mmCIF file of C-alpha atoms and ligand atoms in Angstrom:
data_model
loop_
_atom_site.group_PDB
_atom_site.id
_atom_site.type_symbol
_atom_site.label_atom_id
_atom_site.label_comp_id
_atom_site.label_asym_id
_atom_site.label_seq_id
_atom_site.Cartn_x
_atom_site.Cartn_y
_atom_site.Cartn_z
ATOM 1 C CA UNK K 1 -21.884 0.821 29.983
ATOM 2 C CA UNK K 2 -20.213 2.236 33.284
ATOM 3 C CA UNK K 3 -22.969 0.046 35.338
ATOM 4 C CA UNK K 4 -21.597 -2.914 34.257
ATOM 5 C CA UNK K 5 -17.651 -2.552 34.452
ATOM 6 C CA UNK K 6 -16.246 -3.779 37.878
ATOM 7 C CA UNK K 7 -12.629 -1.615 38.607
ATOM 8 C CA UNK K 8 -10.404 -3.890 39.106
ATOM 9 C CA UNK K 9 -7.212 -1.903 40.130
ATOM 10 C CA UNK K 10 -6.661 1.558 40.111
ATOM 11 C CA UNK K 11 -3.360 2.586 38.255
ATOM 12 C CA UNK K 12 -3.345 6.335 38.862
ATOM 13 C CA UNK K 13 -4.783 9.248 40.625
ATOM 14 C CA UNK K 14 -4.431 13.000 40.654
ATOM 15 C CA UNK K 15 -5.423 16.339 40.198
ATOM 16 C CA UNK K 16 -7.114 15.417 36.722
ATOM 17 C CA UNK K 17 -9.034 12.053 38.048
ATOM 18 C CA UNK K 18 -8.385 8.275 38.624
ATOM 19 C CA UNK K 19 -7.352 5.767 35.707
ATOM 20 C CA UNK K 20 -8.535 2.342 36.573
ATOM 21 C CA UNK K 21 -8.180 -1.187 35.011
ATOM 22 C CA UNK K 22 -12.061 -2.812 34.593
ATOM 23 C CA UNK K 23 -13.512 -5.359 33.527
ATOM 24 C CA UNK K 24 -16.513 -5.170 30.503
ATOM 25 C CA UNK K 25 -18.095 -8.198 29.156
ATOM 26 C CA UNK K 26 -15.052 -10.430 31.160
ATOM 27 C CA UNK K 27 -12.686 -8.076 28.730
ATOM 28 C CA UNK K 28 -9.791 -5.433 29.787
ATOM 29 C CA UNK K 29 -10.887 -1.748 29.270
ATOM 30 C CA UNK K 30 -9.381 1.659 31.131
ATOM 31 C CA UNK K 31 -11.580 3.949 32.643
ATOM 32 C CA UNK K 32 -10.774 6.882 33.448
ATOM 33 C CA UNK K 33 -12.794 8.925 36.312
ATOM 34 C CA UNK K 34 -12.744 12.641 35.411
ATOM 35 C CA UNK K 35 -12.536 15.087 38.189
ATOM 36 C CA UNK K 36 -15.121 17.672 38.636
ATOM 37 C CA UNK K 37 -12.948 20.361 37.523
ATOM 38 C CA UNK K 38 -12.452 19.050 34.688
ATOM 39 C CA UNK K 39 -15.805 18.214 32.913
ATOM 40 C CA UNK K 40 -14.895 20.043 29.856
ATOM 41 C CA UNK K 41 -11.972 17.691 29.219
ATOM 42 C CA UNK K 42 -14.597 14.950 29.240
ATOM 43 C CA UNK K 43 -17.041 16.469 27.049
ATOM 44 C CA UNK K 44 -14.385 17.529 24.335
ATOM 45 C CA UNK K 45 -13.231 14.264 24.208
ATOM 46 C CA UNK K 46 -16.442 12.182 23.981
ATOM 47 C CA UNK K 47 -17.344 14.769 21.171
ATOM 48 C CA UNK K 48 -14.046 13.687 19.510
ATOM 49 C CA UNK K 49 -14.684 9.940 19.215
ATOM 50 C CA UNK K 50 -17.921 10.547 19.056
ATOM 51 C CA UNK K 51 -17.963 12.790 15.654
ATOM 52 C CA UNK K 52 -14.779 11.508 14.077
ATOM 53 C CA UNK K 53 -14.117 8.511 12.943
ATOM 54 C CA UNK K 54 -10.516 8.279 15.001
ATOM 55 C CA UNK K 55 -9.639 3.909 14.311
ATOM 56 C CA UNK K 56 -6.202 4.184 14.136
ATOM 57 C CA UNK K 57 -3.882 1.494 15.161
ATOM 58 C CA UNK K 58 -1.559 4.078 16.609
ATOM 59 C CA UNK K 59 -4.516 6.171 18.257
ATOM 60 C CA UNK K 60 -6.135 5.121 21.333
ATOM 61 C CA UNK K 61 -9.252 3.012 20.776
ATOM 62 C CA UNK K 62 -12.395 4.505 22.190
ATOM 63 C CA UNK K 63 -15.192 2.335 23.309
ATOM 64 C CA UNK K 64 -17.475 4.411 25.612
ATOM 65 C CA UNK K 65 -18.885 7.533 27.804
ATOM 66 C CA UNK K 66 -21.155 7.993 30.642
ATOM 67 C CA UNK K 67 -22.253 9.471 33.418
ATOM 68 C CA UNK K 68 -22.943 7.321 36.524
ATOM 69 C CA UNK K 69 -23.217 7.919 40.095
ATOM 70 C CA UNK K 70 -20.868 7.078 42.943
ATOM 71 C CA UNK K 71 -21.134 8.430 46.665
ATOM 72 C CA UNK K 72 -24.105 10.951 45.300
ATOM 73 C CA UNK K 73 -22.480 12.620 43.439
ATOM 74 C CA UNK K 74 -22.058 12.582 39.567
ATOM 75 C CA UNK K 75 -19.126 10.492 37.497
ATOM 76 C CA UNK K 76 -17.938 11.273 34.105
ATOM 77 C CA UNK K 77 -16.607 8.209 33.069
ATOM 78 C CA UNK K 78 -14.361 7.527 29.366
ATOM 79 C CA UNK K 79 -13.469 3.978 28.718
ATOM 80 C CA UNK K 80 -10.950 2.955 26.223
ATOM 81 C CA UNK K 81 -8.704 -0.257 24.828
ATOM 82 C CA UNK K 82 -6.428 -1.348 27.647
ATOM 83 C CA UNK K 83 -3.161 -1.333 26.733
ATOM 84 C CA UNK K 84 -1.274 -3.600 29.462
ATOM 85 C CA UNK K 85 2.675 -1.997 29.497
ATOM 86 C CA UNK K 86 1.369 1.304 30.602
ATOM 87 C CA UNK K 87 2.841 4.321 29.287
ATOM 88 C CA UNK K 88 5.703 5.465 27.618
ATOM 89 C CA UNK K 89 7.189 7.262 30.377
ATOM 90 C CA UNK K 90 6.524 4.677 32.825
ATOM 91 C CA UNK K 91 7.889 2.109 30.202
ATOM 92 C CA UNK K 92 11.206 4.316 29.322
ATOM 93 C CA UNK K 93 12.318 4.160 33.139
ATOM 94 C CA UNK K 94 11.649 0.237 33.167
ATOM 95 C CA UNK K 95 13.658 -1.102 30.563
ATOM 96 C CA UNK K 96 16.097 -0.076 27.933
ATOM 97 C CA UNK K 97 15.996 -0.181 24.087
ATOM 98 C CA UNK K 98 17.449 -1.574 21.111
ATOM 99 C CA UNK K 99 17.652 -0.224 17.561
ATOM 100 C CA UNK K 100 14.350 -2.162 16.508
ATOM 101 C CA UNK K 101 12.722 -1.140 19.325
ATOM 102 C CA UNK K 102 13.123 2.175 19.568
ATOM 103 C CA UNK K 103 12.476 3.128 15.904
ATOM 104 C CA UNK K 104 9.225 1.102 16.318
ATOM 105 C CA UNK K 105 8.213 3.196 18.840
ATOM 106 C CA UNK K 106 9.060 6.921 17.234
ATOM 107 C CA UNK K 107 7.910 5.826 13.774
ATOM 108 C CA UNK K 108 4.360 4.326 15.199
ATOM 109 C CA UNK K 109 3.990 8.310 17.471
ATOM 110 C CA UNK K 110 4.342 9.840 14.187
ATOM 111 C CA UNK K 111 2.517 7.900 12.134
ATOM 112 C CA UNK K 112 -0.769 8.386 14.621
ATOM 113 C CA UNK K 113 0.613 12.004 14.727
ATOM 114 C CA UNK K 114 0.273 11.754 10.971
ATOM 115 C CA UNK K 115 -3.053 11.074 10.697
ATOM 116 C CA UNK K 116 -4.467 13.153 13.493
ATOM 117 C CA UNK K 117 -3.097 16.148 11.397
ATOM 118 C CA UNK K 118 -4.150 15.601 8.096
ATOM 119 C CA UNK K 119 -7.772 15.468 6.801
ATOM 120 C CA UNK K 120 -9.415 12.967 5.055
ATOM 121 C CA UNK K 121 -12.374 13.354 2.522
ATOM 122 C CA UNK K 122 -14.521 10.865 1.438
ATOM 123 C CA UNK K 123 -15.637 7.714 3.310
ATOM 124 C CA UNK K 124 -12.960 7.213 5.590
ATOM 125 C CA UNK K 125 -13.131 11.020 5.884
ATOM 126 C CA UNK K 126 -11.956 13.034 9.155
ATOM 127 C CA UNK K 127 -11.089 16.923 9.860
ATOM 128 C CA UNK K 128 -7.628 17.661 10.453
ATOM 129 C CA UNK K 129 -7.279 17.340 14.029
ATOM 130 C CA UNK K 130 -4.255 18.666 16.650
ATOM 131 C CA UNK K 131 -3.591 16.949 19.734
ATOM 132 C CA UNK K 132 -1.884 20.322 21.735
ATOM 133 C CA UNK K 133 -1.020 18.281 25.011
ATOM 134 C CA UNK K 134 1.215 15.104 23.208
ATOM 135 C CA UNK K 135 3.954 14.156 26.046
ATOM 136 C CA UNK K 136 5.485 10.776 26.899
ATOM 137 C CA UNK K 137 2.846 10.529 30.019
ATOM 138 C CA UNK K 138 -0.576 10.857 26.713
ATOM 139 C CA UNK K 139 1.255 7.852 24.674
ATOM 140 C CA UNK K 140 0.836 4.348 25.110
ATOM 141 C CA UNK K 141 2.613 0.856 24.819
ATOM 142 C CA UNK K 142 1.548 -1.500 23.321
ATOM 143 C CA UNK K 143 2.926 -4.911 23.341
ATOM 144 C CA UNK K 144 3.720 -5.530 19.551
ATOM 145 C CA UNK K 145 6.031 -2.818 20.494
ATOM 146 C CA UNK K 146 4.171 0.023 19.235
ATOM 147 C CA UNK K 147 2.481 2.658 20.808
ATOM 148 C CA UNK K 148 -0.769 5.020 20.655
ATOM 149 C CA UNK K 149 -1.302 8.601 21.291
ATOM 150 C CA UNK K 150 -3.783 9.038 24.150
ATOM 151 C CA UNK K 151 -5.741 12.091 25.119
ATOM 152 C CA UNK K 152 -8.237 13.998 22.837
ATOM 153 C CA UNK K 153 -9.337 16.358 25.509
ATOM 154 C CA UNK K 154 -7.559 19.522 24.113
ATOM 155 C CA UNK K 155 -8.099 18.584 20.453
ATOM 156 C CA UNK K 156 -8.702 21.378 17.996
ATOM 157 C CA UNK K 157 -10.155 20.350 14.690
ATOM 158 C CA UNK K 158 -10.105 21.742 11.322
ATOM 159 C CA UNK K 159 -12.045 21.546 7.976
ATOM 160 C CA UNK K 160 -11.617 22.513 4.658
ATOM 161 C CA UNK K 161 -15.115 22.253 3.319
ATOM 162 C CA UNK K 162 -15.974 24.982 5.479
ATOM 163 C CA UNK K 163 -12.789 26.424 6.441
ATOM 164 C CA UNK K 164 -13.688 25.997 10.034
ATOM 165 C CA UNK K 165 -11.503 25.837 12.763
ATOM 166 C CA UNK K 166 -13.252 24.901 16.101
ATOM 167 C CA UNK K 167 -11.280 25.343 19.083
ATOM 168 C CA UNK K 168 -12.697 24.138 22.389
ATOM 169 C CA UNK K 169 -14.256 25.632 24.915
ATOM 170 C CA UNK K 170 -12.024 23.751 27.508
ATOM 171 C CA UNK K 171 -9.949 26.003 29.866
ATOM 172 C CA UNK K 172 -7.259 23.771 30.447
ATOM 173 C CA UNK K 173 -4.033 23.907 28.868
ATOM 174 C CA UNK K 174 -1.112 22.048 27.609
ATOM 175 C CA UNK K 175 1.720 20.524 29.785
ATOM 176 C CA UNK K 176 3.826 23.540 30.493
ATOM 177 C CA UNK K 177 7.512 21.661 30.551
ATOM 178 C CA UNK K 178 5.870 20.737 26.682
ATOM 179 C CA UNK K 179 4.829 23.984 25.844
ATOM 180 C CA UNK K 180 6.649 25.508 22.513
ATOM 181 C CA UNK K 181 7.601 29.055 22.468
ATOM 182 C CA UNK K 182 5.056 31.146 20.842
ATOM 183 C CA UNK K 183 2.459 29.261 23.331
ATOM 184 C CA UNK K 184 4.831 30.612 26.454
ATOM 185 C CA UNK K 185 5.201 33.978 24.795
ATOM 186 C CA UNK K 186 1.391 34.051 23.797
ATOM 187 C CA UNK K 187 2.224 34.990 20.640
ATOM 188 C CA UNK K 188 1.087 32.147 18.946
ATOM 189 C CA UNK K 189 -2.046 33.129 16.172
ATOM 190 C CA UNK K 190 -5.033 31.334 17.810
ATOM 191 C CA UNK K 191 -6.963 31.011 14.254
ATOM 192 C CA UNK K 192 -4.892 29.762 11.632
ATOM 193 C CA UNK K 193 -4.681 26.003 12.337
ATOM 194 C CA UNK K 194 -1.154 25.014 11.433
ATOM 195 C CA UNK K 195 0.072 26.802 14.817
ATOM 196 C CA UNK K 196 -1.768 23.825 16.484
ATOM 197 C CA UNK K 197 0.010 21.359 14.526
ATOM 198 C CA UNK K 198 3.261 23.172 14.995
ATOM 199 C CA UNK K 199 3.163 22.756 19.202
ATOM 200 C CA UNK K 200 2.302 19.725 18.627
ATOM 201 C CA UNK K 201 5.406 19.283 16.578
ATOM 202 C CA UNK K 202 7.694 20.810 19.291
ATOM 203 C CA UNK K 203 6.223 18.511 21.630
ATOM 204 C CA UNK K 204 6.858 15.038 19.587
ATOM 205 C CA UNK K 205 10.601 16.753 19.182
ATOM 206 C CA UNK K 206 10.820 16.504 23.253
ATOM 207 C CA UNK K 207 9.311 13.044 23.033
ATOM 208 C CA UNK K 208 11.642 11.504 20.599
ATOM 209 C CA UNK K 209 14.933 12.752 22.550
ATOM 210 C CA UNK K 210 12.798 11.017 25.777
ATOM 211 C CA UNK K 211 12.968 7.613 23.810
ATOM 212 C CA UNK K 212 16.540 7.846 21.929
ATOM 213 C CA UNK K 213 18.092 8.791 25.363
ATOM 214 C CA UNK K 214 17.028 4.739 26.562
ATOM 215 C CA UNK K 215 18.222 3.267 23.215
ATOM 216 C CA UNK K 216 21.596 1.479 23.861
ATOM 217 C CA UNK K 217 24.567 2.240 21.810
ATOM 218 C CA UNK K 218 28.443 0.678 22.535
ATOM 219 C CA UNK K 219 26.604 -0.919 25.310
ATOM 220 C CA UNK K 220 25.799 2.400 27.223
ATOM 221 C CA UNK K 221 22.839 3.855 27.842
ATOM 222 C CA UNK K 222 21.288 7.328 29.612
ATOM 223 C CA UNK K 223 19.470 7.330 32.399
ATOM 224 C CA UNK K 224 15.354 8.809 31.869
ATOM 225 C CA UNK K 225 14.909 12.135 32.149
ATOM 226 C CA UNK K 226 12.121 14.381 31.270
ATOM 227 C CA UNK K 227 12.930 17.620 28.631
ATOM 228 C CA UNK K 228 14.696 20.085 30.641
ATOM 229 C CA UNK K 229 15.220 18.208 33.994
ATOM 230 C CA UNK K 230 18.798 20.287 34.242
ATOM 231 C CA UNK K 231 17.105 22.878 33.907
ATOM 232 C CA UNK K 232 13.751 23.431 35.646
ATOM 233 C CA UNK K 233 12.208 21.642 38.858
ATOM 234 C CA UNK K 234 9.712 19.602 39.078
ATOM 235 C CA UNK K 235 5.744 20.976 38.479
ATOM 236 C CA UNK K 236 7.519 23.644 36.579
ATOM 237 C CA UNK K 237 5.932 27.431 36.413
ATOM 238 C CA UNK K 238 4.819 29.105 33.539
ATOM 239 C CA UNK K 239 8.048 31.632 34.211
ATOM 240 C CA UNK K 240 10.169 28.944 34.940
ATOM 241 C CA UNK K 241 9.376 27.383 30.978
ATOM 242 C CA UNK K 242 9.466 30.708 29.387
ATOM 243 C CA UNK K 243 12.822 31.886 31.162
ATOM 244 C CA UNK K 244 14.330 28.544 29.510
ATOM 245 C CA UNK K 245 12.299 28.081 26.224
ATOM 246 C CA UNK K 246 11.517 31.761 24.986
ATOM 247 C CA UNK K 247 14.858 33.477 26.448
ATOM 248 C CA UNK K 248 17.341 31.512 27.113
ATOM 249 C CA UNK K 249 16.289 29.610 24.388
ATOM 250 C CA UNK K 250 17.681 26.349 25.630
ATOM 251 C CA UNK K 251 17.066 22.930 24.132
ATOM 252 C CA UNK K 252 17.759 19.348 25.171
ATOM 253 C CA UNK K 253 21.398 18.472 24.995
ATOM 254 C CA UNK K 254 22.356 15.828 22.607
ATOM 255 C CA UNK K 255 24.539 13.141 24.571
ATOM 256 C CA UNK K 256 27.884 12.965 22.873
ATOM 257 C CA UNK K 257 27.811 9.066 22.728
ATOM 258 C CA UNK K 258 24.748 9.041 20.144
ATOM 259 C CA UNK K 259 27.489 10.070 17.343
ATOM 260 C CA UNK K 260 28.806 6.837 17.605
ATOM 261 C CA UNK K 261 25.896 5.399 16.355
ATOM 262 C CA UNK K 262 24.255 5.878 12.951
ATOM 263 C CA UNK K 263 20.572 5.585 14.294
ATOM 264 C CA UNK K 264 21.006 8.106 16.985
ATOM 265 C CA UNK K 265 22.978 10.674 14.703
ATOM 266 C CA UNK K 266 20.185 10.480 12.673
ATOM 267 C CA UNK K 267 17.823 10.994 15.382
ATOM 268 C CA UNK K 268 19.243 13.893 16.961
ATOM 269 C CA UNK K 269 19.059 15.551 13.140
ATOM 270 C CA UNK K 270 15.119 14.973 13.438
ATOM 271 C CA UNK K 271 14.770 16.070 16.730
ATOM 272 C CA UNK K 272 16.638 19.376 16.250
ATOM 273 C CA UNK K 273 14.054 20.154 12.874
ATOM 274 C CA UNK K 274 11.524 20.002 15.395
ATOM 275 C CA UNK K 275 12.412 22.466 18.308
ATOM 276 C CA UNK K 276 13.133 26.017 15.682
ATOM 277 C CA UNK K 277 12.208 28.821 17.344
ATOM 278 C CA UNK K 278 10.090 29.751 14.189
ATOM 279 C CA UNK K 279 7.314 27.492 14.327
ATOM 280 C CA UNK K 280 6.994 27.907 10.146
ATOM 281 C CA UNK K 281 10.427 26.062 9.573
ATOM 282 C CA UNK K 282 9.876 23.070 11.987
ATOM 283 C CA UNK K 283 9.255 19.543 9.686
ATOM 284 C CA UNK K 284 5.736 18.159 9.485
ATOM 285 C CA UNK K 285 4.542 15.214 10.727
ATOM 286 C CA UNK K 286 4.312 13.752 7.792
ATOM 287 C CA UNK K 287 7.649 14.408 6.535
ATOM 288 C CA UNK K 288 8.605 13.337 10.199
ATOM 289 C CA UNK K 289 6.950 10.127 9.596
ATOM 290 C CA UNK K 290 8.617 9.320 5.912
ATOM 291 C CA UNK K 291 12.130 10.278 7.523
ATOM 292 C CA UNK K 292 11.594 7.434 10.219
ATOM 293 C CA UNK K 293 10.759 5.377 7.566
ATOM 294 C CA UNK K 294 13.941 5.609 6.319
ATOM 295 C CA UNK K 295 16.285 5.733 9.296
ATOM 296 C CA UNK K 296 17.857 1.955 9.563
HETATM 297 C C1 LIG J 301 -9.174 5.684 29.702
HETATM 298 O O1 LIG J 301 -8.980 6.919 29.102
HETATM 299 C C2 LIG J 301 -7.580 7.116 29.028
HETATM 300 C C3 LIG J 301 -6.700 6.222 29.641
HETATM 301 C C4 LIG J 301 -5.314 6.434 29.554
HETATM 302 C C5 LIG J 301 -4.373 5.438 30.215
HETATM 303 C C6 LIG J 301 -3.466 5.897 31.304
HETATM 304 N N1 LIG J 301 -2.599 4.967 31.900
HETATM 305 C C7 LIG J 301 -1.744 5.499 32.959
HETATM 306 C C8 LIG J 301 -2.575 3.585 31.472
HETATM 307 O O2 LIG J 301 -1.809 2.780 32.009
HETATM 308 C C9 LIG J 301 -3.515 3.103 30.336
HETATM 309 C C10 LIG J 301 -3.515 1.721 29.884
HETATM 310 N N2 LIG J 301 -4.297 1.323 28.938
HETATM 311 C C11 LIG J 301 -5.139 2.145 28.329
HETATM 312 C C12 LIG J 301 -5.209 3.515 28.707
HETATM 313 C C13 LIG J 301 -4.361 3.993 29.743
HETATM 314 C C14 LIG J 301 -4.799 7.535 28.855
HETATM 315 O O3 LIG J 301 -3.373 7.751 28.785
HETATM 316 C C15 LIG J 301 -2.971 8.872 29.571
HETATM 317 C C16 LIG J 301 -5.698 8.446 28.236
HETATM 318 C C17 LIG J 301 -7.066 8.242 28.341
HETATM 319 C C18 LIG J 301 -8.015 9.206 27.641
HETATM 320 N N3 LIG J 301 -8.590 10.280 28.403
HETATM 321 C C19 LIG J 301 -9.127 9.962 29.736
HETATM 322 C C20 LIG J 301 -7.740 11.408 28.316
#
């Protein structure tokens, strides 16, 4: 179907490849233009939407893959939903949010969360699937207010049927200022799945102290920052993250003013059950996604 999207504007490109707004059938869609290095990211992720039945309000809607050709030489296009405000961290340094808001947002990242991580039997069956690169920059906005985790390229899936756990064959890796512990340490146990769904865990702990820092409170707000902006530069190293994460063992600091608030009190409690050192005592994203539930 890549012959007969027009790009209309191209929102980003870098290392990884170009996202673009198109055009298919006169309707929105986002394209994304893989870069040759990074083939296997494209392949892993068509074989995710391809195999699974993913239709999740709060997971990114696929519609298509190809291969086309552009200056002779091969494309490897994926085209998804297009999701107008962008994404989460470009939406977090636009505006600021209110208590509505900005449970909306953390309870719709775990719910997706939730059912990426869980498997389904039966009809509306799926493997248990975990994301291993979730970051503010892989979720979405949409404009009810809600978002949707992007980014199936890393995805390891699980089954119980067979017991199989099938890794990829993809090279890359996850976000390094994301990374949890045992992945910077390398001791995390490659074959048992739940140490999949326990970065990814870490990870939505970082996220949710992204979005509760732009949630205003007495009328005051923080500023956007990434996880550990104090405390490592920009395009951080794999030494830089493990120095911080694994030795130091440093977390994000909780703002003082969120204690005058009861939604941000309760947030930082959440947050902190995500980031143990053990991976084996961090919450679920399930019981992440019932405690959201409840907060407010
Ligand atoms: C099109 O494929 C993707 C697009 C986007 C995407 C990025 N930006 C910046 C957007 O504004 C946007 C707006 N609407 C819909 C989607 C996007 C994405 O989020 C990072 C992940 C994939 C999936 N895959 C190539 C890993």
């Amino acid at each position: 179907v890549a012959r007969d999207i027009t790009l209309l504007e191209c929102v980003g490109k870098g290392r990884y490849g170009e996202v673009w707004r198109g055009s298919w059938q006169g309707e929105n869609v986002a394209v994304k233009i893989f870069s040759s290095r990074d083939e296997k990211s494209w392949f892993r992720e068509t074989e995710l939407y391809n195999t699974v039945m993913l239709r999740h309000e709060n997971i990114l809607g696929f519609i298509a893959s190809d291969m086309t050709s552009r200056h002779s030489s091969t494309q490897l296009w994926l085209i998804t939903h297009y999701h107008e405000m962008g994404s989460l961290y470009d939406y977090l340094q636009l505006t600021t949010l209110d208590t509505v808001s900005c449970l909306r947002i953390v309870l719709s990242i775990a719910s997706g969360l939730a059912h990426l991580h869980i498997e389904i039997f039966g009809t509306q069956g799926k493997p248990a699937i975990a994301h291993r690169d979730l970051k503010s920059k892989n979720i979405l906005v949409k404009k009810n207010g809600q978002c949707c985790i992007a980014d199936l390229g890393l995805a390891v899936m699980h089954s119980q049927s067979t017991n199989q756990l099938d890794v990829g064959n993809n090279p890359r890796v996850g976000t390094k200022r994301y990374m949890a512990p045992e992945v910077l340490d390398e001791t995390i146990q490659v074959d048992c799945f739940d140490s999949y769904k326990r970065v990814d865990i870490w990870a939505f702990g970082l996220v949710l102290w992204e979005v509760a820092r732009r949630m205003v409170s007495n009328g005051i707000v923080e500023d956007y920052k990434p996880p550990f902006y104090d405390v490592v530069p920009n395009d951080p190293s794999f030494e830089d993250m493990r120095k911080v994460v694994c030795v130091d063992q440093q977390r994000p600091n909780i703002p003082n003013r969120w204690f005058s608030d009861p939604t941000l009190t309760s947030l930082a409690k959440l947050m902190k059950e995500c980031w143990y050192q053990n991976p084996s005592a961090r919450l679920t994203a399930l019981r992440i996604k019932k405690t959201l539930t409840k907060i407010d």
